[PDB]
Structures are given as structure tokens and as C-alpha cells.
Amino acid sequence: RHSCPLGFGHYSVVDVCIFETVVIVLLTFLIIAGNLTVIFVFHCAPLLHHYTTSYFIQTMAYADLFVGVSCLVPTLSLLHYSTGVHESLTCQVFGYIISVLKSVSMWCLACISVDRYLAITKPLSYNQLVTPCRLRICIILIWIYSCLIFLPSFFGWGKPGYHGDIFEWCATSWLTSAYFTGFIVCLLYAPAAFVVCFTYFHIFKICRQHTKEAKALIVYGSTTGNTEYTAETIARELADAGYEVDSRDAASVEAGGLFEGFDLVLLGCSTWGDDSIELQDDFIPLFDSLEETGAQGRKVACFGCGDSSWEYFCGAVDAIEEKLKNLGAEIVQDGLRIDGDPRAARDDIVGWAHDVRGAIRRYLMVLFRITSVFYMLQLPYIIYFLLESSRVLDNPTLSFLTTWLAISNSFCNPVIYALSDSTFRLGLRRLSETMCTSCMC
Ligand SMILES: Cc1cc2nc3c(=O)[nH]c(=O)nc-3n(C[C@H](O)[C@H](O)[C@H](O)COP(=O)(O)O)c2cc1C
């Protein structure tokens, strides 16, 4: 209370430590609001692509949310409007609950990697091996195991980390054990880091030695032939890449198991309707029975032709994207919306098709990135914890920065999802629309 984290050797019982306070108030609001929306997007999403990976992401989202709600207490201590009672107790609990959560996410990242490893190495075996029962067992085990590797903090085995250095009591009253540090390294950091390292090494080496012929389907609806030209343009672009393309007219296809077999599905539709958004006549039946196509888990993307003079430029691309999202499709890229003549927009269509080919690996890239940013944000804390448990270097400012740089990973996951996952961005947009509906009613 007399000290200050970035206080630079000065002691004054007066200071409110505003710089540290605002940095913490800012990180509390960003960790809560960011993960609240991730959780609400899941709540509104009817079906998912990558059900198990999404379940570990939702667990990480709750873990990160609980960090922010848990970060109200040290923020309350910095404002000290009401500091409650028993600061040392308050501090111990806070340091623990924020140590178990950084581990819950540590294991969810280890499990998502194993999940993707299994989906690649044993693809036929995967669906019997990774089951809802084993997944629920696995997540309950991550919450139980996390509480146990940090439980000796309450049974005089020493302090488990600097998550409590914020409160004055843990800076003076608490001291870390190199035995406790060595035990939690061999039970959390070393095993979870090894798992992630091992799995990603294998999965990325497999993505090299694939040589697997990629089969893509295009289904277009055109009443004047523009989406058909755009489809044909897209097809030639994918064929040039190496794809086995089947471009079919929507009026010639039956909905039943239509997407089955294909690694990529592009859906084209022009927009129609006199004072309405209506789908192209040939697509209307395909859209109404899109359920039967096998859209779940499917890497899909949309494109269409429209006229910008219309209130909803390519409103069909919007309707199709919304249903595909709701059937558990992975929308790998924001839809291509062609204004007037597509023959004039060939460079756009080629560019979009080029990008959609690089958008397939996007789901693996985000998981690897979510993990890569996690380890480089908690690596400083574990190497500072590694040393200061052995007492090699002891700094309150380095403790604050490493601690809150690790506490900062909690708001990073939602910004990676928001600026990389096209299905997520779409779920986020529709969530906003529902908030304005509650606002009206
Ligand atoms: C009745 C009517 C409604 C239309 N509504 C829209 C619209 O809401 N949004 C849009 O972008 N284009 C709209 N258009 C323009 C068509 O989407 C455009 O002509 C398109 O290039 C047709 O492509 P197709 O050849 O693949 O049918 C409309 C055209 C008609 C005749």
C-alpha cells in the first residue's frame, strides 16, 4: 500500500498508483468484454465445424473471462474505495485462481493440438477415439487437475507465482519454492509445452508430404449468366492450382449429400426480388434443402453477382453465408460480391479464388497462432518464475510486467478470432443485430 509496482524506488503511503491502475482497469475491461462476446457467439451459434476444438476454445474463453472478473479485486485494491478485509488471504486466493486459469488454457491448447494431430494421423479412427463422453471427461479433468497442481499454495508448500505481487501482502508475506516451481514445471509447463511442440511438429510435416488431389465443387444460380461466368472463372483458377473441380448449375443438383466428397465448396448466387432480397430461382430449392448437403464441417465460401444500385448489394451472398454458418460450415473467406459485369472484374474473381485456396489452412493457422502468441506471452513469466524461485533475479517491475503480460494473453484470443475467422466475424455481426432487436423491443 506504501509501495508502487512501477514506483521506481520511492515509498509514499499517499499515491493511488494511477498508471498501474488504468493499465489494469483497461486490461480487465478488454479481458471481460472480449471473452463475453466469444461466449455469446457460441451461445447463438446453432451448429459448429470442429466441435471438439471449439469446446476447448470455449473453455479457454471462460478461463480468460474468469481472469478478467477475478481482476476486479486487484483493480478494487488499486482504487481502494473499499478493500474489504484480510488482504494477505484475498491476495493468496487471487494469485491461485489466476494460476489455475493460465493452466486451464495451457491444457486446452495442449488438447486442441492433440485433437488436430488425431484428425490428421488417424482420420478413420478419429470419430470413435474423440467422443463427447471423452471430451467432457477431458475438460472436467483439466479443471480438477489445474486446481490440484496449485493446491499446495494453501498447504504451506510456498507461493505458486507473482499473480499476487499486485496486492502489497504477497510482495512481503509470500515467498516461492524452487521445489514447488520444479514440481509444477514437470506437471504443467514441461508436459503441456512438450505436447504442443510435438503435435505441431508432426501436423506441419504432414501438411508438406500430403500430395493429396483436392476436390472442389462449385454450385451456381444465374438468371442472366453472370454468376455462371464468375463460377467458370473461379473453376479455371482452382484447376490451374491443381484442384479437381465440379462446377454444377443449382437447377441440375439434388441437395442430398451434395457437399460429401469435396474438400472445398464454393456457392454462387445472384440476388433478386422486387422490394425484397430473393435468391436466384435455380438456387431457391438448393438453399431450402441446404441441411441435407452435408454442410457441417465443410470448408465453404460464397460468391455472387449483384447491382450496387440495390439496397442490399448481393443480399443472396449474405443469406447463403448465414445458413451455411448455421449448418456448421467453415466459411473460409468473406464472400465475393461482383458489381455488374463480371468480365470486367476478372482480376477480382481470380484474386478471390487465389485467396480461397490459401484460406483452407486458415483454421490450423489460427490454432497454431492462438498457441504461439500464448507461449510467447507466458514464456517471460515462466523464465522469471524459473529464476526468482531460485532467487537469481528479484524485480517488482519485471514481476508486474511479466505477470500482466501473461494476464494480457486473456484478451488476445478474441482479437485473433475476430480478425482471422470469417465464420466468427459473421457470428459476431449477427450477435450485434440481435442486440439492436432487444434495443427496439
Ligand atoms: C427484380 C430484381 C431484383 C434484383 N435485386 C438485387 C439485389 O437486391 N441486390 C443486387 O446486388 N442485385 C440485384 N439485382 C441485380 C442482379 O443481381 C444482377 O443482374 C446479376 O448480375 C444477375 O446475375 P445472374 O446473371 O447470375 O442472374 C436484381 C435484379 C432484378 C431484376
Curated annotation (Swiss-Prot):
- Look up keyword Transmembrane helix and say if it applies: yes
Which SUPFAM superfamilies does the record cross-reference, listed alphabetically? Family A G protein-coupled receptor-like (SSF81321)
List residues in topological domain: Cytoplasmic. Answer: 43-64, 115-136
**Compartments, as annotated in UniProt:** Cell membrane
Where does the UniProt annotation place the signal sequence? none
- Which cellular components does GO assign to this protein? plasma membrane
The record's PROSITE patterns line, in alphabetical order, gives:
G_PROTEIN_RECEP_F1_1, G_PROTEIN_RECEP_F1_2
InterPro entries in alphabetical order? GPCR_opsins, GPCR_Rhodpsn, GPCR_Rhodpsn_7TM
Q: Which GO terms describe its molecular function?
A: G protein-coupled photoreceptor activity; G protein-coupled receptor activity
Tell me what topology the record assigns in the membrane: Multi-pass membrane protein
The transmembrane segments are 22-42, 65-85, 94-114, 137-157, 181-201, 366-386, 397-417
Give the keywords, sorted: Cell membrane, Disulfide bond, G-protein coupled receptor, Glycoprotein, Membrane, Receptor, Transducer, Transmembrane, Transmembrane helix
Q: What does this protein do?
A: Gs-coupled receptor activated by antipsychotics reserpine leading to an increase in intracellular cAMP and its internalization. May play a role in locomotor activity through modulation of dopamine, NMDA and ADORA2A-induced locomotor activity. These behavioral changes are accompanied by modulation of the dopamine receptor signaling pathway in striatum. Modulates HTT level via cAMP-dependent but PKA independent mechanisms throught activation of RAB39B that translocates HTT to the endoplasmic reticulum, thus avoiding proteasome degradation.
State the family named in the UniProt similarity comment for this chain.
Belongs to the G-protein coupled receptor 1 family.
Q: What is this protein called?
A: G-protein coupled receptor 52
